[PDB]
Design a protein around this nucleic acid. Structure first.
Lengths: 84, 96, 62
DNA sequence: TACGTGCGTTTAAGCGGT
DNA sequence: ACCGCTTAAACGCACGTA
């Protein structure tokens, strides 16, 4: 038995980032934005997930719950409604 | 053959996506990314479905807001095109 | 023989951590391998998670 | 001169079942 | 986690112009 290592951030594609920017009201977009956005996204995700898992570990669970994520977000001042 | 001028379709897309609420990043690559990042914090993790959806709602809300501020920075510099320096200014002033 | 620490980088340890191990003075997978977790953690810029990944992947290589 | 627009191609996301 | 089918989205490129 084995399962393989992977690299993912490039899966957040250019047209997706464009759609996000459109919802943000952006009309024109430099080519260098996409990579920059990816870095930013990664940092964000990392921070939230780091906290979420901490909660998961405190509860002595192996499954990250919606509440774990909600608590992480809350404690980072980014309160999320809808997943309680 | 018909062709819209640069900007017309962009504006159309802005109206379109500001009108709607659906998630804008594809499910499977986002999930893959989340599991990858999570692995460097704790081994053997599983995820509730709604946990991944929670992370995606939060991430997309964050990026959209950041793009709003970025856009404000671009316009401040008398541009209509967002650039990495716009993002970096926005994130510095946010305290990120 | 030796197992130069370069091969550890293909296991998915990031290259910065391998540079930190060489700065510490570990230059082979043999070097990281026969040490407990705390040796790698005391190195600047190395967490306990990276040390566990190093020892696990070194035990795979060694 | 770099980016928006359009067009042909290809790639994979999505959906449905299990 | 995987198989299969479909098709819409991504991608590569040409070109003009903002």
């Amino acid at each position: 038995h084995r399962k393989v290592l992977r690299d993912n951030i490039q899966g957040i594609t250019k047209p997706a980032i464009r759609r996000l920017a459109r919802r943000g009201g952006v009309k024109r977009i430099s080519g260098l934005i996409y990579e920059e956005t990816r870095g930013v996204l990664k940092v964000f995700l990392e921070n939230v997930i780091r906290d979420a898992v901490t909660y998961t570990e405190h509860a002595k669970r192996k499954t990250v719950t919606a509440m774990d994520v909600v608590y992480a977000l809350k404690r980072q001042g980014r309160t999320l409604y809808g997943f309680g | 053959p018909h062709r819209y001028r640069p900007g017309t379709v962009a504006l159309r897309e802005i109206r379109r996506y500001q009108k709607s609420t659906e998630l804008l990043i594809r499910k499977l690559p986002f999930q893959r990314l989340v599991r990858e990042i999570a692995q460097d914090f704790k081994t053997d993790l599983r995820f509730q479905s709604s946990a991944v959806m929670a992370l995606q709602e939060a991430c997309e809300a964050y990026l959209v807001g950041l793009f709003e501020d970025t856009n404000l920075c671009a316009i401040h510099a008398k541009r209509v095109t967002i650039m990495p320096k716009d993002i970096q200014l926005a994130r510095r002033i946010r305290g990120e | 023989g030796p197992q130069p620490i370069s091969r550890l980088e293909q296991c998915g340890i990031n290259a910065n951590d391998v540079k930190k191990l060489e700065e510490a003075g570990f230059h082979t997978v043999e070097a990281v391998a026969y040490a407990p977790k705390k040796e790698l953690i005391n190195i600047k810029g190395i967490s306990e998670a990276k040390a566990d990944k190093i020892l696990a992947e070194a035990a795979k290589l060694v």
